């Protein structure tokens, strides 16, 4: 999807 | 008191994309603003200079600030490995919003993103702390080298950065 993460990059 | 302005001078292959100028809302989130400010000046001996926009998703955002692992997995703050979410007062109201990337609650480090759309599903999860005031066209140039996966086509480097005011 549209998230902004640092390590577990998600959909 | 005051809301700092900072700049990011962005290049690729030693060829300039331009300057992005950001206001930091220290009036609302001074701790978060201070971290970013100091990472721009480099006053603690580490910071954004030389690091990349590593994850760039057209129609969404440009993400940067991993100056430890250089891929999204790292970064650190001027307060330690991580710091808590200061507040969620500011919202992801539209293009140009500057907000912290994280790995869930209370995991702010150095990574950040610049929105190219409104991203209000991040409200209450990502601390908003400023916005672009000049150089949205630069941001659009960055975006042109991204992809749905977020992989960029070339190394988009923050060659210099600092505080304007």
Author numbering:
A (entry chain C): 1 to 11
B (entry chain A): 1 to 165
Quote the study that presented this structure, word for word:
To determine the precise binding mode of JW47 to CypD, we determined the x-ray structure of the complex to 1.1 Å resolution. We utilized the protein sequence of CypD (PPIF) with a K133I mutation, which enhances crystallization without significantly affecting activity. The core of the macrocycle is almost identical to that of CsA itself, whereas the pendant quinolinium group can adopt two poses. In both poses, the position of the quinolinium group is partially stabilized by crystal contacts with a symmetry-related molecule. In one of the poses, the 1-(pent-4-enyl)quinolinium (salmon color) extends back over the macrocycle and makes an intramolecular hydrophobic contact with [MeLeu]4 of JW47. In the other pose (magenta) the 1-(pent-4-enyl)quinolinium moiety extends in the opposite direction to lie along the surface of the CypD, making hydrophobic contacts with Ala-103, Gly-104, and Pro-105. JW47 showed similar binding to SmBzCsA at Ki of CypD = 202 nm and Ki of CypA = 236 nm. JW47 has less intrinsic CypD binding than CsA but is a more potent PT pore inhibitor. The greater effect of JW47 in mitochondrial Ca2+ buffering compared with CsA indicates that quinolinium is effective in directing the drug to mitochondria in accordance with its more negative electropotential and in agreement with the Nernst equation. Neither CsA nor JW47 had any effect on CRC from CypD KO mice, whereas CRC in the mitochondria from WT mice was significantly increased by both compounds, proving that JW47 inhibits PT pore opening via binding to CypD.
The peptidylprolyl cis-trans-isomerase cyclophilin D (CypD, PPIF), which is genomically expressed and imported into mitochondria, is consistently implicated as a key player in the sequence of events leading to PT pore opening and eventual cell death by necrosis. CypD binds to the lateral stalk of the F1F0-ATPase and positively regulates pore opening. There is mounting evidence that CypD is key in mediating Ca2+-induced pore opening, and its absence (e.g. in PPIF knock-out animals) desensitizes the pore to Ca2+, in an inorganic phosphate (Pi)-dependent manner. The CsA binding cleft in cyclophilins is highly conserved, and mitochondrial targeting provides a convenient way to obtain selectivity for the mitochondrial CypD.
